[PDB]
Design an enzyme around this catalytic site. Structure first.
Site, mmCIF file in Angstrom:
data_model
loop_
_atom_site.group_PDB
_atom_site.id
_atom_site.type_symbol
_atom_site.label_atom_id
_atom_site.label_comp_id
_atom_site.label_asym_id
_atom_site.label_seq_id
_atom_site.Cartn_x
_atom_site.Cartn_y
_atom_site.Cartn_z
ATOM 1 C CD1 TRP B 139 -2.648 1.692 0.464
ATOM 2 C CD2 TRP B 139 -1.771 2.076 2.485
ATOM 3 N NE1 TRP B 139 -3.219 2.840 0.957
ATOM 4 C CE2 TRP B 139 -2.696 3.096 2.197
ATOM 5 C CE3 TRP B 139 -1.092 2.107 3.705
ATOM 6 C CZ2 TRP B 139 -2.947 4.139 3.077
ATOM 7 C CZ3 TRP B 139 -1.356 3.139 4.584
ATOM 8 C CH2 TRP B 139 -2.284 4.133 4.271
ATOM 9 C CG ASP B 221 -1.794 -1.641 7.577
ATOM 10 O OD1 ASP B 221 -2.966 -1.348 7.891
ATOM 11 O OD2 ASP B 221 -1.095 -0.944 6.816
ATOM 12 C CE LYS B 257 -11.046 0.075 2.411
ATOM 13 N NZ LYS B 257 -10.998 1.462 1.872
HETATM 14 C C1 LIG Z 1 -9.765 1.625 2.579
HETATM 15 C C2 LIG Z 1 -8.668 0.839 3.294
HETATM 16 C C3 LIG Z 1 -8.828 0.648 4.804
HETATM 17 C C4 LIG Z 1 -7.645 0.404 2.549
HETATM 18 C C5 LIG Z 1 -6.397 -0.427 2.892
HETATM 19 C C6 LIG Z 1 -5.420 0.036 3.948
HETATM 20 C C7 LIG Z 1 -5.776 1.006 4.825
HETATM 21 C C8 LIG Z 1 -4.957 1.470 5.817
HETATM 22 C C9 LIG Z 1 -5.490 2.585 6.722
HETATM 23 C C10 LIG Z 1 -6.417 3.396 6.226
HETATM 24 O O1 LIG Z 1 -7.512 3.849 6.799
HETATM 25 C C11 LIG Z 1 -8.213 4.630 6.006
HETATM 26 O O2 LIG Z 1 -9.230 5.158 6.292
HETATM 27 C C12 LIG Z 1 -7.544 4.716 4.781
HETATM 28 C C13 LIG Z 1 -7.782 5.420 3.446
HETATM 29 C C14 LIG Z 1 -7.928 6.787 3.335
HETATM 30 C C15 LIG Z 1 -8.105 7.362 2.086
HETATM 31 C C16 LIG Z 1 -8.130 6.568 0.948
HETATM 32 O O3 LIG Z 1 -8.313 7.138 -0.316
HETATM 33 C C17 LIG Z 1 -7.963 5.200 1.058
HETATM 34 C C18 LIG Z 1 -8.003 4.325 -0.192
HETATM 35 C C19 LIG Z 1 -6.768 3.465 -0.440
HETATM 36 C C20 LIG Z 1 -6.948 2.202 -0.759
HETATM 37 C C21 LIG Z 1 -8.363 1.636 -0.854
HETATM 38 C C22 LIG Z 1 -5.753 1.299 -1.031
HETATM 39 C C23 LIG Z 1 -7.787 4.632 2.303
HETATM 40 C C24 LIG Z 1 -6.392 3.926 4.939
HETATM 41 O O4 LIG Z 1 -5.448 3.723 3.946
HETATM 42 C C25 LIG Z 1 -3.704 0.909 5.946
HETATM 43 C C26 LIG Z 1 -3.315 -0.097 5.070
HETATM 44 C C27 LIG Z 1 -4.174 -0.537 4.073
HETATM 45 O O5 LIG Z 1 -3.770 -1.550 3.198
#
Ligand SMILES: CC(C)=CCc1cc(/C=C2/OC(=O)C(c3ccc(O)c(CC=C(C)C)c3)=C2O)ccc1O
Ligand SMILES: Cc1ncc(COP(=O)(O)O)c(C=O)c1O
Lengths: 410, 410
Positions: B139, B221, B257
């Site tokens: 990520w 994570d 999610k």
């Molecule tokens: C949607 C999630 C939880 C995806 C995966 C994931 C999340 C986290 C922590 C997070 O908490 C959050 O709110 C968000 C967030 C904020 C803005 C945003 O545009 C996105 C989209 C990015 C994607 C879908 C890859 C996610 C996070 O990025 C840490 C590791 C991860 O692999």
């Protein structure tokens, strides 16, 4: 060591939270807590604004709303309304479209986002040497926030004069003309935390004139617009004066007090630039800093403000709830001054009413405070600051007599 | 008289933002967006969980709730159930009271607060040189969040095997054996992002062996617990296995999610240590980190999760909503592999069903991706990553045939 966290000590407890902790432990029946960091009614109770409760009902009943990610910069309607509240609907900077707004997590987030940007793109590339100036006693975390952004030279400027019990304008202006060019100046837009005394418009013009010909970057802290004096135009005069003078500045807006939404973290970082293109460049890099801090801002609190400001009927009711908190604060200030002068307390006490907003510098020395804390069980910081909303019609007689007694002795 | 922002470069949009932007401008009526960063229904709509709508009503009908500042660490009931959801009710670390929890602005905020702490108190004071290890396809914000904390040596460990379209176990374990001692290893607890392929429990037992033999700090994570498999206990097995093996670790929890509360920014930083006294001292030092980032976390999102996990009747409605999202993604994967193998497409395609979560590595090269975007108007990243929830029963037949062309023609 066995534990990875073994060589890590317990953090220093902040001084005002220890004060509240010792208050709720004091068994005295006459104890008064004047160190609460929020608005309290005449019955020592928090007050949820009726406009907020009404707006929250419609948001809960609005199926048009989902919970998808807001933009990185935040809710658009909240950003434009928040900056129009501080700059005014007739602002020339808005007509020229040289204004940007980053939705923040209260004023603290706007100060952190702004300081992170300045420590990266302002006065060179990653220039952590730019001096940053704060007031005589500033907000306890102004120093900590800019220190966290990497700034290694945080200075102070004279602001509050203990003997006159007011603004030290000559110490302010001389600390400014002695500041290096392109230095950052943290400025309380209105309702100075924690002194409560603000510069007059004719004093702001002197403060602005020094910063203009020395290129001092203004960083406004607007945490009590409307909440302080009850007038949205007068509380934002210093900000709008810098706009008419052609200044470029950041302005950390907070809605935790004028809306009472402390726990929803509603803030806005307003940016004013020479050019409309400079704003899109600043907002371009604000997204990168946001992305790695909080990925995007929450929606509930910002939705409450945007609905309130953009709806004329709810905007009128909101100003009614704001004047409620401001007039009570005004009443408590005048009632205390009238009581202190009736008992013939030595010294001047017009500063109790010259100051505005929730917090007030009472003007007592540290050991006069200890008398109020240890002997009379009235809890306030050794700084001499009280929370005026902590005063009630029931405790005003006891507090005023105690302050009188504290100045009689000592 | 130039501007202070005159030399600030206009930041370009991210690749995922440009993909969605190019998608909604594409005029072809066959266009399929497989790059949305959130769950979508079979009707290409966002989905507010039915339990969230009900809890939002209960909170609005609760006149007892005020809006005063939550604790710096957050709502105690939310931190109670968030960590309890990850470690298990009968976890030994909880009954031994060696667990801490910091309410954060989503998982991104939990990563930031944890990274800021490790950059200050882990492996010495202010040690910005401790190597940080991330997955080879990770990520993207993992490097960005830990770089913003000051870590100057961000390393990668082999993870995705492009040829076998699976987990490179020997590349993972080899990079951990050669990792410097006390290095931070960012671990995807479940549903790896962006590959979707997860280590088996017996594969996790070999990863935990090397990390223990070399004192590697795990930074978990957990961003899809429940959302990926529909089973909360299965999605947290790796975390709970590290607890049973005596690890001290962080675990950035996300509720964007499994609750669908993306724009309320609900996260938690679970801290697991050896001695309970050190855990409290860690939470104290994190208060100083928090209050200079966001002064305190928001309440609405944490209230929703707390009410859900506290009330047993609302807990099952949530797992039923969680099961709906996990089952639809499970079925979309199953039918994608079915149509691909029915079409006699070259290569193996069990990885589509071997992966877990709404993100999948299709195993396509960047030039096979260009054919899908240019000639078929299916928008995905050059990495080959698709959001499986972007697949619907009305476009699935068109996407599978499109993937068949890209591998047979390119
Ligand atoms: C949607 C999630 C939880 C995806 C995966 C994931 C999340 C986290 C922590 C997070 O908490 C959050 O709110 C968000 C967030 C904020 C803005 C945003 O545009 C996105 C989209 C990015 C994607 C879908 C890859 C996610 C996070 O990025 C840490 C590791 C991860 O692999
Ligand atoms: C001067 C000053 N700046 C910043 C803040 C931070 O406000 P918030 O809690 O909304 O972040 C406060 C409190 O309102 C304040 O008094």
């Amino acid at each position: 060591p066995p534990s990875v966290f073994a060589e890590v000590p317990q953090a220093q407890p902040v001084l005002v939270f220890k004060l509240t902790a010792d208050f709720r432990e004091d068994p005295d029946p006459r104890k008064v807590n004047l160190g609460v960091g929020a608005y309290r009614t005449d019955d020592c109770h928090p007050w949820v604004l009726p406009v907020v409760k009404k707006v929250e009902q419609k948001i809960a009943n609005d199926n048009s709303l989902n919970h998808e990610y807001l933009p990185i910069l935040g809710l658009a309607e909240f950003r434009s309304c928040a900056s129009r509240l501080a700059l005014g609907d007739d602002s020339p900077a808005l007509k020229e479209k040289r204004v940007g707004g980053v939705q923040s997590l209260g004023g603290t987030g706007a100060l952190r986002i702004g300081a992170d940007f300045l420590a990266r793109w302002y006065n060179g590339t990653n220039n952590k040497n730019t001096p940053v100036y704060v007031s005589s006693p500033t907000w306890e975390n102004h120093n900590a926030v800019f220190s966290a952004a990497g700034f290694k030279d945080i200075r102070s400027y004279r602001y509050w004069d203990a003997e006159k019990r007011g603004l030290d304008l000559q110490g302010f202006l001389n600390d400014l003309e002695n500041a290096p060019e392109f230095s950052i100046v943290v400025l309380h837009a209105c309702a100075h935390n924690p002194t409560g005394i603000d510069p007059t418009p004719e004093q702001w013009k002197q403060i602005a004139s020094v910063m203009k010909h020395r290129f001092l970057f203004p960083f406004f802290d607007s945490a009590y617009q409307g909440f302080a004096s009850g007038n949205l135009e007068r509380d934002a005069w210093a900000i709008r004066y810098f706009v008419s003078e052609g200044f470029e500045f950041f302005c950390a807006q907070s809605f935790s007090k004028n809306f009472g939404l402390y726990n929803e973290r509603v803030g806005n970082l307003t940016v004013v630039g020479k050019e409309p293109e400079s704003i899109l460049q600043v907002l371009s890099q604000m997204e990168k800093i946001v992305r790695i801090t909080w990925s995007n801002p929450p929606a509930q609190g910002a939705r409450i403000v945007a609905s309130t400001l953009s709806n004329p009927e709810l905007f009128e009711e909101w100003t009614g709830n704001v004047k409620t908190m401001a007039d009570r604060i005004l009443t408590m200030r005048s009632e205390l001054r009238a009581r202190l002068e009736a008992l013939k307390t030595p010294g001047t006490w017009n500063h109790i009413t010259d100051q505005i907003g929730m917090f007030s510098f009472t003007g007592l020395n540290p050991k006069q405070v200890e008398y109020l804390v240890n002997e009379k069980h009235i809890y306030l910081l050794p700084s001499g600051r009280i929370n005026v909303s902590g005063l009630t019609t029931k405790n005003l007689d006891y507090v005023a007599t105690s302050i009188h007694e504290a100045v009689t002795k000592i």
